[PDB]
């Protein structure tokens, strides 16, 4: 399958992934594209902050989905 990741400005890009790719895997693929390291990357999907250990399977991020990218965060 393939997913979309909307990056900082809005220039949308696509990633080649499959259901058991971890969010850690996806955050090295966005380092290939946008030149941002996986440690200052946070991925949002449906309002939920996607965790680094868990898979694309764990949030049902199927074919044609659009993840969003923000530059590191900490609430509180």
């Amino acid at each position: 399958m393939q997913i979309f990741v909307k990056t900082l400005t809005g220039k949308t890009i696509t990633l080649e992934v499959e259901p058991s790719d971890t969010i850690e895997n996806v955050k090295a693929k966005i380092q290939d594209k946008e030149g941002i390291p996986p440690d200052q990357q946070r991925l949002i999907f449906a309002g939920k902050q996607l965790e680094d250990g868990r898979t694309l399977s764990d949030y049902n991020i199927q074919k044609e989905s659009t993840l969003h990218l923000v530059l590191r965060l900490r609430g509180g």
């Binding site: 900082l8 400005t9 809005g10 946070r42 949002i44 449906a46 309002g47 939920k48 902050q49 969003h68 923000v70 530059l71 590191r72 965060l73 900490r74 609430g75 509180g76």
Partner: protein, 148 residues
Amino acid sequence: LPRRIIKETQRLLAEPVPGIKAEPDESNARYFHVVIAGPQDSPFEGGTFKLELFLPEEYPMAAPKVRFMTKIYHPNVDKLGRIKLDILADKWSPALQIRTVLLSIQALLSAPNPDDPLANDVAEQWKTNEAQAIETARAWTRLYAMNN
């Protein structure tokens, strides 16, 4: 009105973010009427949470000011509806835009961190009784967020 502001504003109205409606204000453009969706799997599910967002006249060297208007039972939000999020203070960069701020606030409804400043006896309720905090939040969502 710095060109960047204008370009951001249009790349919101043209390119929306789902469950995040953000228009500019007519009285003064540096000032947005934001509305965030109660996220999936959160105790805020199906709430219409209204926000006011404002760009100071040193945007984007300084970050935007953002404040909830809708009352919501959440550690990292307060009495008057201001928010504790580092991208709005400690770790802001002109790299970030309005849309990024709005996505991180949405993220915060799905990840309420009781480590606030003191976040009332609300963060204290979250850390010592998650069960009934989820409950209460679900109530303030129903009883203050359903525009109906």
